[PDB]
Design a binder for this molecule. Structure first.
Ligand SMILES: NC(=[NH2+])NCCC[C@H](N)C(=O)O
Ligand SMILES: NC(=[NH2+])NCCC[C@H](N)C(=O)O
Ligand SMILES: O=C(O)CCC(=O)O[O-]
Ligand SMILES: O=C(O)CCC(=O)O[O-]
Ligand SMILES: [Fe+2]
Ligand SMILES: [Fe+2]
Lengths: 337, 337
């Protein structure tokens, strides 16, 4: 398979769960300054085989994601799936939020966005009634199209972590790598050139944040990125293993550039054709390599009966200092005027 | 002080030394594939207070370096300072080489250069007889001028680790940050523009590697960088806390660009004026932030009596994948055609 996979033994999973539960006892919140600082060191106490996997798999050249299977989740303890991300920090989900951050700490520095889900670091992916046909994570009936997370931003995550709290109907996350076996060298050349526009996605809009947050200055920066996007490349780095920056619904060619458009058009077709499925069953965690792969989510019919699919999510950078220009008073919540 | 400092307790230092000694027993070499992979996980067994320091201090906004004092070194066990880096992997220095790599593993991914000290990851800084007045690390009588490590390369280290095996006469390492208190905004603007040339330093030349290594294709890339340097910026990122890329002896303005030259001239003067000293006593380890600070070494009179100043050195990147274009058959030894 095109991702790297690790299955916790029941004992290893229990030990990891126990560690997260201890953290949940000792800290007030996952996004508090204290746990943000301590989590990377506390993570050193996770099962050694898992730490070895995370240290090695991160350095392999090929995988689109690192997938860890077998974290126990008790639906009775977890409670009902929240109706909105706003109210999704439920006591039942609290230990698993801590668990996700512990795993994340092995791969890098976690962070959030001032303009997304009220500046939370641990965020939620769940269907919101009335928002089935939107372009955001809370959609359902409309497929979430493939994308690089926060493609518009130079400070976008290196890895995106997704922990499945529940997924009773096995709804697939989608993935695709760079279609290197089919991109001709001229098209490739053009994709490496700064000839494309990527605008911020709808999750960064004021309407998709709580009314209280609407005043934030960081929404100014989002508006600038939407109104006056600077041309950037889709592919960067090594021609034989390029890094990818694209969003199927928020990318465009530079104005009037038909050669760039043709390259983007070809890329779309090749990515659509090579898109594959990864089902995150309850307790599965994936860390998607946001430079090697784009990802999305298959269309599904939401339940709204309290047992909808529900993920916890977190952004990870290999280097927090790369985004210091966007440190919005805090280094862990990013945005700009 | 402008760096972050940690002093090991005798017990902590002994525990760290013991761990490195165990590694030296169990692995054949520091640069072998096995220890390179395992070191970051083995480092989780270092004293917890040190791990906390390394995790937190790396994320602070201000320090030019992370300095760890108090690693014991026994000169009798260490043996005489080698006459050349070639023969510097002495049994007496072996545990301390492992120790350096363990500390390095807490901060990132270590790597070396195909074109420097025969592609070694752990390298040596010691005076070489006949080479006192050179621009390389083995100089002495001539001051090693301030520089960003491997400034010419986009794959240059994020952190440079220096472990002092001996330094009986307290020879100072030099450091300077961006002179933000004195750079006017016009000069600053120009330094942020791609109007400067940075060429590879002499340590990357064939003459400063073993005759056997002379055939390496990676020297081709060095020659290209020396002959046809592409214009780059000196300052990048946040205007209020810029990252720095400059080498006092290998930087130049773009051809005929007198405004760029004036900005570089001003920068030189301000850096010379703000340069300060850090003395790495025997057993001290510094991890210099290669983006916030330039560094060098004061002129000193070499002894050549077997007790010359001697450091082990290692390059660290926050993300090995950023250099995949330069993975010279191995991800840990960098270079290009
Ligand atoms: N093509 C897209 N739908 N892009 C936006 C992806 C979803 C976005 N990351 C969110 O949290 O809502
Ligand atoms: N300005 C300079 N002297 N630059 C080169 C610095 C020394 C170089 N890093 C070496 O290992 O030899
Ligand atoms: O629901 C999923 O599996 C993915 C959600 C997502 O890509 O959010 O940006
Ligand atoms: O000798 C020192 O302290 C520094 C050596 C160095 O900057 O090597 O590039
Ligand atoms: Fe996404
Ligand atoms: Fe140096």
């Amino acid at each position: 398979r095109p991702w790297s996979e690790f299955r916790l033994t029941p004992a290893e999973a229990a030990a990891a769960a126990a560690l997260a539960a201890r953290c949940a006892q000792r800290y007030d919140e996952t996004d508090g300054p204290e746990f943000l600082l301590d989590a990377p060191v506390i993570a050193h106490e996770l099962p050694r085989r898992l730490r070895t996997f995370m240290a090695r798999a991160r350095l392999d050249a090929w995988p689109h994601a690192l997938v860890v299977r077998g974290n126990p989740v008790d639906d009775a303890a977890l409670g009902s799936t929240p109706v909105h991300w706003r109210t999704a920090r439920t006591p039942g989900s609290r230990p698993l939020s801590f668990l996700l951050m512990l795993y994340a700490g092995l791969l890098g520095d976690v962070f959030g966005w001032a303009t997304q889900q009220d500046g939370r670091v641990v965020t939620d992916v769940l269907p919101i009634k009335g928002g089935e046909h939107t372009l955001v994570s809370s959609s359902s009936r409309q497929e979430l199209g493939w994308h690089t997370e926060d493609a518009f931003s130079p400070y976008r995550a290196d890895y995106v972590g997704l922990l499945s709290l529940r997924n009773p109907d096995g709804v697939a996350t989608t993935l695709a790598g760079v279609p290197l076996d089919d991109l001709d060298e001229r098209t490739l050349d053009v994709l490496f050139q700064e000839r494309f526009l990527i605008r911020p996605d709808d999750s960064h809009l004021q309407v998709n944040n709580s009314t209280a947050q609407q005043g934030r200055v960081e929404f100014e920066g989002i508006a600038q990125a939407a109104d006056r996007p600077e041309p950037v490349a889709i592919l960067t780095g090594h021609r034989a293993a390029p890094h990818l920056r694209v969003d199927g619904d928020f990318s465009a060619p530079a104005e009037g550039d038909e050669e760039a458009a043709a390259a983007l058009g070809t890329l779309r077709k090749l990515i659509d054709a090579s898109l594959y499925e990864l089902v995150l069953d309850q307790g599965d965690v994936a860390f998607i390599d946001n430079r090697r792969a784009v990802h999305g989510r298959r269309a599904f019919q939401p339940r709204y009966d309290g047992r909808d699919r529900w993920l916890k999510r977190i952004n990870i950078t290999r280097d927090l200092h790369r985004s210091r220009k966007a440190w919005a008073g805090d280094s862990r919540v990013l945005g700009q005027r």
